[model samples]
Target chain A: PHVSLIGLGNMGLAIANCLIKSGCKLTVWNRSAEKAASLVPQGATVAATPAECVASSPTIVICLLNQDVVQQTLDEVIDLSGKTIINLTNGTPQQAVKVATLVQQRGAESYIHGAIMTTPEYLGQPSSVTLISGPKTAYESQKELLSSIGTTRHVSDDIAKASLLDNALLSVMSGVFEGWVQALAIVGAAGEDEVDFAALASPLVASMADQLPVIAGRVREKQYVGGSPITMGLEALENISETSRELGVGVLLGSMREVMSEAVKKGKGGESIAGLVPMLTELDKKW
Target chain B: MSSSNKPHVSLIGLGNMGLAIANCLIKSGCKLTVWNRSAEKAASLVPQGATVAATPAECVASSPTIVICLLNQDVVQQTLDEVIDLSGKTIINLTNGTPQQAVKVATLVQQRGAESYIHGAIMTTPEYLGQPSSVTLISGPKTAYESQKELLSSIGTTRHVSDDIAKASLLDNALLSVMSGVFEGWVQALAIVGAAGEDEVDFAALASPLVASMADQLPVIAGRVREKQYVGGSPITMGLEALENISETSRELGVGVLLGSMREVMSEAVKKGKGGESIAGLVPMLTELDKKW
Candidate 1:
């Protein structure tokens, strides 16, 4: 129930407050000192240095700005021996692996890697989340403290699992954003108000969500299934190219069309949208 | 409703989607008229209380409302030209075309004395027609939409978006853009996991719900796009960090570049001190950034 917090940025403050609210004894430290000013009055202890802050608790939470900074800052402390180390920093799969190894070699009892999936505003909400990955017994130790941060999503024991997914999920989210932009970019280029386009589009596009589980399930089974087969997906892509063709302020509609036409050419036209994954495989290999 | 008193529909084309609409229209108790270049295409509908018309000219004369589901705008204009007269008749073109083309056709129909015209971009496959899950977007004169919205509703969830026929067609193409990019993202995701020996299918199971939820946010995201605000959550800088990992790893995994444009746009926004803004706000920067991105 005792934890030491390193760094006190807006996100770190939110996380610290969540830990305090969850009834964990919290000692917070920031290099500038006063960043922890808001926390001290709220019942968190203020420590003078990184090591002093980490020395005070059985569990240490690293919520710094970067992977390099988190490690560099923790290197000053040097000892995580007997302490449970949990990093809720922003980083990649390789970063996770690097940090997990460094923290363990420095004599930390266990290192739990985490990727927070929400903004600071959602820190303590039900939908708020932190995806963590590491050892079983160590996670078994701090599971209570994690629940306070948000809804926790777990992957495997390897530190990179949650980290890879953090980026994977971002790719998914960005895909939608890019599509929206490409859609409206052309619509705006064609002299249509985005609001008007949104009105026509909002209702229909929302339902595309319902198709995900079915799509995901079919993908797992490696089956190409759909009411609207590959023929329709190709048809839609062709329309994407042709509709966006008139405007010079353009978007990537033509590029989007190339894949569908390529699939049809590659003889993958028999496969629906789900099966086109293999069609993009050439993008993955080098000559 | 008796056959004599019932409203009538004249349908052109007997492709898969066309035939599906014809079947649904007849089963719903409407008097139907049909025409196809191949006379045998009308054989099945004829046995089900549908009148077989001898020619496009006769087909156009059979009802006040004609549903044109031809291959494209050229075929549609050609077929309508032979119909001789469209005075006071309503034409709902389910044929796919550019927004500009839709406007051209709508104007042409009005000149031909058609009472109204609605260009619909069918948002579902034939299987989902007549159910609310499918949406057919229509646009034209608001008055034209008003008079025929009910009969059109029988086809699916119908949204009469604007009097400008171009808007409906634009919206249709806009949706496909969104879907195409979303699919590409998943392909990238599957390839990443596959590098670790996870099958694409398994990653798909993990990815689908994630995407489903992402799609559900389109309307709200659209609101943000309209307001020019993206402050609700993640900043473009934060996103860029994650993106770099995907790109570098994709090279290692051979994930190819199906959808890397957004990341480049976001990277540019970060350079100009706009990274703190929401992802929704990046479009203005993306708009001017251009074809090079």
Candidate 2:
């Protein structure tokens, strides 16, 4: 029941507010000290220092600005004995392993690395998914307490998994945005409104998103079969690329079409879209 | 009341998509008039319930809604031009063509006195023809789409993009750009993670939610893009550092070109001082930038 929240940034505030609302007996800390005042009205005890906060609770969520700040804070207080450290800091997988090692060396029983999926706005919502990867027992032991923060995933024991998941998803976010931009550009080339096309595309995007789960399952079986083939995909991209050029939107379609064009060349056309995984992996390694 | 003589739907093309749809319609209890240039394609369906119309005009006469999926606009236009009275009938063209062509056909069908004209683009392969996952974008008269909505569902998820018949084709062509971009995103992500020796499967399992979340944000992003509200406190910046790291990691693994190309695209926009804009803001930059891969 004694849960500590370190850092009072927007995300940290959201996490604190949600836990407080859920009747969590909370302890709070922040560098400025004044940020801790916001939690005062919510029945949270403000800790004077990191060690003070660290000593008070078995579960302390570290949501510092970056890995450096996390390291700096952890350095300020070495005693993490019998503690569960939930690192919500943004950093590389390499950084997570280092943090986990340091926390564990100081006798912390858990270092649950998190890649917070949503912004602060969704932090209070139960649906907000914060992917955590660390020791399974640590997660299982603290599951109920952590669940108050939002939906938590113990992705793997691999310390780097959360960060890997984070960056991989970061890539996905970038890709989807880029993809939609290209879509809008292509449609705009034909003089259609972006919002109108988006209206039609969004629902289909949602539906196609359903295919991702199956695509994911296929990856588990290592069978990327029975879907649209590489050849047809290539041909479609080619036509789109060519059409974009004719309509003077060729520049926007260039990078994207080449991605598929190259992929199809290596994937050999007959294999389904799933076939691209190994091909992409190999091409990546070759690159 | 002979079922064979009742009002039914006419399907003119017997291609993979056409036949798959015909099967769904038959299952939905719609009587059918089907015509294939080569009548052999009609053999299996003929046994099921579809009457094999001897001519295109005969197919048109037998059904209230004529679904045409021929090789091209040329054949489809030629075939429909022969149908004598389209005054009370509807023509749903599922042929592959440009928006101009679609609108042109809609006009031709209208001139022939068709009650409503629907232009469609089936955004899936034959395998998903009748499944709900299949996306079929239709743009035409609203009344036609409303009345024919049930028979349409037998094909798949129907998206009524616009009453403008040409919009469906435009959406289809435009979506190909976004779809491929999304795929390229995965390819790039796979390459980066592939270097870490991460299992492709679990990442995909994790990535599925990524699709929904991103797709959900699309409309929001579109709103941002539409209003030119690129700057401010949105978690929508095209941060170059992570992209740079991804590009660098991908390159160190030989998979760098994929992300490199994407990075280049981003750089083209960022160089113009638009990096701070939401990712959707790239829409205007991509359209206006005189750049290429």
Candidate 3:
């Protein structure tokens, strides 16, 4: 299969190399000629402009800086009657839908929204995940070509689900990272070695990771029974927050204690900790 | 089977955790002897083939291995004072306390002619006592650990973290910090998604793989923290802006920001001229903050 890449940033370049090494006839276009020229040594054909890049391949991979840049770069292409457009730019679900509508109106045969869930160094590796959403027919045809970059998953046919999930996953990953940092700081303030703290923290973190889905299942079924009761959990939060404050790192879990306190006040004290979901969902109307 | 071939064990407390440990030991076929400050707590174990000792001294005299799960270090210290002879005995202390307390108790026991003193910290509650995944961290002499390893495994997976007796309690506190933050962070994340009109189940489905993948990389990040290298990742400046956006979104969506403390910590790190470094660079900032005040 032949593929054309329209951006030459770090991620775009790595994706291009993966395509070329996997035996795809690759044509690339970058705003700067030097970046595109570097790929030529690896048997990539450099397209002079964005329009030329679109005309040369059946599958066009767009990995630009942002959605605005993606739209501006696509504006240069005069026609796209048969080419399939795959946009990997970071954007919200609404933006994904807008880009899909724009590309389809411009005579593109199909639009695929993808979110790469790995760094540049991880491109084409076995564990790398690239989530894509599009129409079934177009996705089926280019699925083989996309698989060269990583484990390409067909997440949804809605074309915006991939972007929606991309944002949700970002929030979750950020929370985990923030939690790790807070834990490190708390223990560091206690005069413990960071290495020793991490060794012990890793397993605890991993165990919590294993429980995410289980807790979610409880939230789904509204089965907020038989775990640590909310009353007990609230007490634990208060104690830990107090400990953290005494350590001079301040209270990292104070907000959570506030949340749990509200649940207890609402008479959910005897329920499992997952009972906080309804309390959180009720806040949607408070705005 | 001869009673001489079985490992005779004594438990000196009858609290919730102590009772769980006693049950698991009996289930694992150890001949058990028990004592408690209040004798009635030992009533249930008598039906389970355990001998009730009238006093702490009598409890220790009945067995070669004694497991103490008292309320605190002071309680443990006071209870041990009542035991007249601890010679040629192994004392397994499972009381929750600071590393210094573990060290203090270890010193007190060794001076009384105890053959071994191993401090253990149970990482799970009473309900999870016998599960294979339930962890109990212990640290002491390697020889002491080897002698009681089989009996300890009855309670949970036994992790001998160090030969230094204080390391077990220190690691226990470190683990509690990690878990508390992780759980707090997760629920806060849920509040954000809920406030945005998204179903938690959908968010959980997407989060599973991401969280799982992140968990695998924690050890690598831990290694970086240990090495004091903060290069080749997202710069602190970019992270600061992203956090600012999250904080703003939480306010706009009416879900109060739950990560403000962490955001402030990150902001202070960046202000201290670490904008170009990775977030791991914040470790020294906290270390210094502790020393300053």
Candidate 4:
């Protein structure tokens, strides 16, 4: 199989290596030509321009810096006829749709939007998940090539689904990330060593992470009666928030607790914690 | 002979957590003795081959090891005040409390002539009490832990942090703090995505792997925080950008900003010239929130 990869940044370079390793004739291009030097040694042909790269293969993989660069690169090339464009540029759902539309205007029928969920170092590993959203035909055509890069899941044909999912997951991560920081701070406030604190925290975090799917399942089915009751969750959150303050670690849980408290007061206390979804939904309605 | 080989264990406190643990011990074929403040709670266990002790003293007398899962340190102290002749008994307190409380309880149990007192933190729900991922953190005298390791393993994966008894309770809350943060973030994500017309189940399925990836990275991040090596991995600048995106999207969608505090903290770190550092570098900045309270 033949493939042209535009952008030789860390992720792009790693991706290019994965393709080369998988026995593809790889054509590579980067704004800074020097970035393509390493790939050349791995039997990758250095394309003089983005157009040159696109013309080299029917499969054109773009992992540029962002959506702006993606638009600029596609604009420079100006014609994407007879090419399948795979965009791994990190951006919003709106940006993804714009890129997909731009590719269509340039005569490309298939545009695959992707969000790589791991760093460059983990590229091509089976554990590395590459979320894909775009035309099913395009993904099917390049599924083997994409799989070589990592595990590939075609989320939807809606071009924007990949980015939306990415954004939402990152939002979840931001919460976990900050929450871990708070945990560290609380432990620090108590004068415990951070490493030891982290040691105990690691497994607990991992175990709790296993609960996301269960919670999501409950919310999906509107099964709000069996898990941790909203009343109990509220009490725990309130206690934790107060504990955080007493320990001088800050009241990070206050916002969460207030929301929980409202649910309890609204007579949804008997419902599971998953019941908060409706409450959050209500807020959007009022807004 | 088979029954004699089964370890004899006593459980005090018939709360949801305590009963779940008692069942696990019973299923593991341990000779079980259970005592609750209200004897009605132990009636179900009696039908399952558990002996209901009339008092804490009777409960402790029936088994070589006693597991206490009361509400808090105050309750635990009050209950222990009722028990007599703790000498030659191994006390495993699985009550939820602070490190200070743990230290105090461990001291009281030892001063009363217990063979060893182990402090434990159960980090899962009752339904998951004996599952492999059901984590129970233990800290106490190494010999006592070793002696009871198999029995504890029957209940869950036991993580013995250290001989310092307080560390177990500390780890428990620290982990709870992390879980609370995860839950807060999860709710925020669901709210935002649901507002945008995405199904909760679909969002959750996709989010699971991402959450797992982050969980795997936590230990690595901890290492970075410890060594002050924040140069590599995901840069803090990128983290700030992600937070800004979540905040902006939440505002745009009219959903409540569930992660406002997180965004502000990350923004502050970026503003302090540490934006180029790894996300782990944010640990030191977290202490700055100390002034907020």
Give the worst 10-residue stretch by lDDT in candidate 3 chain A: A278-287
Docking class of 4: acceptable
Q: Give per-residue CA lDDT, model 4, range A148-239, as digits (tens).
A: 88899888888888877787888778778777877776776767777766666675566655778888878777787888777666655554
Ranking 3 against 4 by DockQ, winner: 4
Please rank every candidate by TM-score, starting with the best. 1, 3, 4, 2
Docking class of 1: acceptable
Displacement of the residue A204 alpha carbon in candidate 1, Å: 4.2
lDDT of 1: 0.74
Q: Which residue pairs in candidate 3 collide?
A: none
| Separate DockQ for every predicted complex | 0.39, 0.32, 0.24, 0.34
Superior candidate under lDDT, 3 versus 4:
4
The better-scoring model by TM-score among 2 and 3 is: 3
**Model 1 / residue A246 / CA error / Å:** 5.1
Per-model chain B TM-scores are 0.82, 0.77, 0.86, 0.85
Model 1 lDDT tens row, B1-293: 23456798899888777888898788767889998887687788888999989898898889999998887777887777766678979998998877777877887788878888888888877777888667888888888788777677678778777787787777788778887777666656665665555555545556566655653466666677777676775788877777776665556555654555676677778888888877676667545534534
Q: Each candidate's root-mean-square deviation in Å?
A: 4.1, 6.6, 5.9, 6.0
Query: What is each predicted model's overall lDDT from 0 to 1?
Result: 0.74, 0.74, 0.75, 0.79
Clashes of each: 4, 7, 0, 0
| Superposition error at A71 for model 2 (Å) | 5.5
